Design a protein around this nucleic acid. Structure first.
Lengths: 33, 292, 172, 159, 208
RNA sequence: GGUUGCGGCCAUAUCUAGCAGAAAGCACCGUUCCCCGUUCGAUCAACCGUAGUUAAGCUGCUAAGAGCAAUACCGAGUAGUGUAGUGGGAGACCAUACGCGAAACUAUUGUGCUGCAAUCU
RNA sequence: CCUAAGGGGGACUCAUGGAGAACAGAAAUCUCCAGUAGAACAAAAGGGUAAAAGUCCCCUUGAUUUUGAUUUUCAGUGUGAA
RNA sequence: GAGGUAAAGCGAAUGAUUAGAAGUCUUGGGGUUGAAAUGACCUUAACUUAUUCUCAAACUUUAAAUAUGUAAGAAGUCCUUG
């Protein structure tokens, strides 16, 4: 069968970790302890 | 938590696009490429065959661009077709062909090139350009303008293109967008082009639908049934409309039931008028008063 | 006039998007695509990773996920099939501020399709995009514009429409 | 070291105006230039073809050639102790008609129009322009405008 | 370490601020610009006294720090730490350079300190306090003048505190409901904008 | 006067939030045999104008509206500046003479005009 | 440095933010809304660019031949570039 | 006609920067609530909104003075036709 793929729409050429991905920006998922 | 975006500084520095670009109606890239004339042809204008399709109409205008605004040479509307014998399906491919033929004939009548550059008098689906006639005026040259609507092979715009090309106008074009063109084998099937020129596809659809879905046939083709038009004589409608168009390509305006001032007075009743500065001042004062 | 009870203001499903984000490529992604085309009857499309993350084990331009878009009555049929898995019980925090909604099933076999051991089991995301008549205004090429405020789809209107249509319960 | 490239020092000159970026309005492409016309040169930064050199930005010249998309402009440049004849090829996006002629051309018509009227009337009419003359005598009425006596005011700190 | 201030007194060079072109710039000595009861509302301190430059000159940041400390110490010792609010109205943004720390080849200097460029009539420090505390604050600023080079004038402002309104028109606006508090400063009603919001924000406003 | 097509200047035209819109036009709208394009007839392509709606788009009006534009016994002849002095001052700088002359601020007003063709209660 | 990152045409809109979807979490993929460019355009910095000059798709070799004129540096010589 | 220097501006873009105020903490910590419920509380710090003090040779909406290009006719303007 056909094998289409989603085309590129963004402009970020470099293969680096993107923005809005910092450590400690998350809550405590184990708060209830 | 996030910065409010629509600030006053955002509006102050905002550069609004062109009026007819913000409307989403004029592609100024294509308009620049089309309108701009070779500077050594000083005041010789370029002529645009502006072809626009609405939900109920086809507009084919011949336009020249000027600094004060575009100027229309001739115009053909699809709703002029019932005068020439086409009452239903005014947005066909064949209706587009008839509109193109009508605008071409009317333009040549206005210019005076009727006997010379008659065009393709026998429509047989052959690809053809209007060559000049030796020791005579060159054929009227017009360039197609489709605006924002897409270039697809078999589109209705190239129906107007073929109608104008067969009418005697010299509109440069290639046949690889006409229906009946094979992409893999680089030649045009004239039979299918001739079929769409004389409304063959609609007749074929009526034939295929009449024996399969009677209710859909009644609903879709109600006008043909109520007019006693069978699939067999549909092509004759377009063939006779072609002859009628070529015989009398003149423009006949609709005789107006009312005068310009009557229309103006009737319309002026249903328009709100801007408030006087005193009126809004009084409104503000009343609001302050009622706020204690 | 601006009558709320107008014919053209009726909500309907614009599209239903089915998403399977398998974290790798190769055989598993191909089998997920096979699941999607079995479910929807139309060819799915594979989506590439937008960037490289060591934690997730993915690399940029690696085919990670597969998704498909269905429209028409088939969207309604698949949506009710999926709601059977969810037994018609959604949460108030399943509807976006723009009037769309979605959920996720953990087993694709629960939808009512034959299990196979080469294929395996894959979880799936269902998203339903709601809209009224006249959305073409925002999608057409010529004279494209926006949608007026009263015609817009919002959270509460979608919530009551869903409760009316499917007789389901929306956990608030 | 030193840098003396083609577009050196053109940071602000070749910028588009504030809230005036984007595409060119098409009245630019509709104007008709003839040989002998007088045009103001102003480089448009959005079109990099046919762009004038930074010296000619702000100069006015004579159109001497008309091409497909450009015009030839004559500029006189001081080089040492004399003027050198320069011939610059400019796309019409960087060229605008100079308004100095249309003002003078009207005066040519007005002078011709006024001279035939006096000839038709048999009188003589003087068409030379005149500089602002000293104002003549006049009488100032004080009725309702009695002079008010002003005096310098005392020093005061306002901060 | 420091050259005498006479070496950097005059505004001979163009402004040289911290930017992406000079990055190895040390910090200014003065880091605090509001002293005293800085959270006091406008009404408690109607009297304003300025130290005003009569010189087009440069004042080093450490001179600003010394003058600030001197004035604060005196006013606090005499009338208490809560009787006044002192604001330094000049910030050191100009970087001075030093060359030595061969000959005049490669003589471009390295950052040496920070200075504020003041004009004639420019305010250096302001102090808002009570009227009864006038003579104290002046004597506090009169000492601070000894830490500055050049000539400075002590001027009693015609305005109410740090507001731009004179002491008579501030009363005129307050008694008409035309002013509200926003902490250490005030907000004035504007006759432009949304009427409902303006009326809500200033409930005591007598419209004319 | 309304509307449509093609435009000129390119916010007095934009933006936000509300309300109204006769006729025509435009629009949304219905269908998939055909030309054609899609993961998806959503866009695009074709057909019907037939089944429906002014709900939206569009137009107009409202807002001590944001923005924009213009004006000024507004600020201010202020800042700045050309020219001059065997002017002042230790200097930094300043005043004067003959000329030119802002910006911000303040206040008020306004919120598209218009060309060609066609059409309309 | 690049057979495309050159040429033409077409389709689309970017950075980012918000609200939502099993694993999935601050960062995967999907949907909508907002988004005057706050992205990207080989390489310095500046300018320029939004139905594009950016991203993607299709076709191509005009990065071809002949020799003249002009601009910059300038002696109005050369070279380079345009 | 052209300019972007002086001046001005920063409750206008970029960058720098003082101080409080009011809100969101639902994606900050500290404590006190709970025999557990992340669901309230007081505080510091973050953001957001309306304000506030001070700035820029390699910032800017605005924008001088001086200097600078062009024109002010007979080789011009108009009328008819090769």
């Amino acid at each position: 069968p056909s094998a289409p793929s989603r085309e590129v729409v963004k402009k970020n050429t470099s293969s680096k970790k993107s923005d809005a991905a910092p450590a400690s920006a998350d809550p405590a998922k184990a708060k209830k302890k | 938590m996030q910065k409010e975006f629509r600030t006053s500084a955002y509006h102050s520095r905002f550069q609004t696009p062109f009026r007819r670009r913000q409307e989403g109606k004029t592609d100024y890239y294509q308009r620049k490429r089309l309108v701009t004339q070779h500077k050594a042809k000083y005041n010789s204008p370029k002529y645009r065959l502006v072809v626009r399709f609405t939900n109920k109409d086809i507009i084919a205008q011949i336009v020249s661009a000027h600094i004060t605004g575009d100027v229309v040479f001739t115009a053909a509307y699809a709703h002029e077709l019932p005068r020439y014998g086409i009452k239903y399906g005014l947005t066909n491919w064949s209706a587009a062909y008839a509109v193109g033929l009508l605008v071409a004939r009317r333009a040549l009548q206005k210019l005076g090139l009727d006997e010379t550059y008659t065009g393709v008098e026998e429509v047989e689906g052959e690809f053809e350009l209007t060559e000049a006639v030796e020791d005579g005026p060159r054929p009227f040259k017009v360039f197609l303008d489709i605006g924002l609507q897409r270039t697809t092979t078999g589109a209705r715009v190239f129906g107007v293109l073929k109608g104008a090309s067969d009418g005697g106008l010299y509109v440069p074009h290639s046949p690889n967008r006409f229906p009946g063109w094979d992409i893999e084998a680089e030649e045009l099937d004239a039979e299918l082009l001739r079929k769409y020129i004389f409304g063959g596809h609609v007749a074929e659809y009526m034939e295929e639908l009449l024996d399969d879905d009677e209710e859909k046939y009644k609903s879709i083709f109600k006008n043909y049934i109520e007019e006693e038009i069978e699939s067999e004589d549909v092509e004759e409608i377009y063939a006779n409309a072609h002859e009628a168009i070529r015989a009398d390509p003149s423009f006949k305006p609709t005789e107006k039931k009312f005068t310009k001032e009557q229309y103006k007075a009737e319309s002026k009743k249903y328009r709100q008028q801007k408030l006087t500065r005193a009126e809004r001042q009084a409104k503000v004062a009343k609001k302050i008063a009622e706020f204690k | 006039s601006d009558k709320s009870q107008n014919v053209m203001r009726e909500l309907r499903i614009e599209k239903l998007v089915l998403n399977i984000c398998v974290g790798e490529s190769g055989d598993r992604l191909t089998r997920a695509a096979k699941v999607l085309e079995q479910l929807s009857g139309q060819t799915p499309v594979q989506s590439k990773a937008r960037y490289t993350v060591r934690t997730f084990g993915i690399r940029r331009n690696e085919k990670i996920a597969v998704h498909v878009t269905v429209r028409g009555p088939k969207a309604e049929e698949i949506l009710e099939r999926g709601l059977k898995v969810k037994e018609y019980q959604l949460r108030s925090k399943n509807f976006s501020a723009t009037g769309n909604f979605g959920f996720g099933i953990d087993e694709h076999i629960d939808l009512g399709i034959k299990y196979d051991p080469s294929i395996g089991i894959y979880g799936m995301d269902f998203y339903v995009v709601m809209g009224r008549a006249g959305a073409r205004v925002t999608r057409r090429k010529r004279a494209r514009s926006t949608i007026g405020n009263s015609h817009k789809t919002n959270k509460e209107d979608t919530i009551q429409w869903f409760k009316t249509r499917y007789d389901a319960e929306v956990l608030d | 070291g030193k840098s003396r490239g083609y577009r050196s020092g053109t940071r602000y000159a070749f910028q588009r105006d504030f809230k005036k970026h984007g595409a060119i309005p098409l009245s630019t492409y509709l104007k008709v230039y003839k040989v002998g016309d007088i045009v103001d040169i102003k480089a448009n930064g959005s079109i990099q073809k046919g762009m004038p050199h930074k010296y000619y930005h702000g100069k006015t010249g004579i159109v001497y050639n008309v091409t497909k998309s450009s015009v030839g402009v004559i500029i006189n440049k001081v080089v040492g102790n004399r003027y050198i004849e320069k011939r610059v090829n400019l796309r019409v996006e960087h060229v605008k008609h100079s308004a100095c002629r249309q003002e003078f051309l009207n005066r040519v018509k007005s002078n011709a129009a006024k001279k035939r009227e006096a000839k038709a009337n048999g009188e003589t009419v003087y068409l030379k322009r005149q500089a602002a003359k000293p104002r003549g005598s006049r009488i100032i009425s004080t009725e309702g405008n009695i002079p008010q006596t002003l005096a310098p005011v005392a020093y005061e700190t306002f901060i | 370490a420091r050259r005498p201030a006479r070496c950097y007194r005059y505004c001979k060079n163009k402004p040289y601020p911290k930017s992406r072109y000079n990055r190895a710039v040390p910090d200014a000595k003065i880091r605090i610009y509001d002293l005293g009861r800085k959270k006091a509302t406008v009404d408690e301190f109607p009297l304003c006294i300025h130290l005003v430059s009569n010189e087009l000159e440069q004042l080093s940041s450490e001179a600003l720090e010394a003058a600030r400390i001197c004035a604060n110490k005196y006013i606090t010792k005499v009338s208490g730490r809560d009787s006044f609010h002192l604001r330094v109205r000049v910030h050191p943004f100009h970087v001075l350079r030093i060359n030595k720390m061969q000959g005049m080849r490669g003589a471009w200097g390295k950052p040496h300190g920070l200075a504020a460029r003041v004009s004639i009539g420019q305010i250096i420090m302001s102090a808002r306090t009570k009227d009864s505390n006038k003579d104290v604050v002046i004597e506090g600023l009169r000492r601070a003048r000894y830490k500055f080079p050049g000539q400075q004038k002590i001027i009693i402002s015609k305005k109410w505190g740090f507001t731009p309104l004179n002491r008579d028109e501030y009363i005129a606006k307050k008694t008409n409901g035309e002013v509200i508090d926003d902490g250490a400063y005030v907000k004035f009603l504007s006759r432009k904008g949304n009427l409902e919001a303006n009326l809500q924000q200033f409930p005591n406003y007598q419209y004319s």
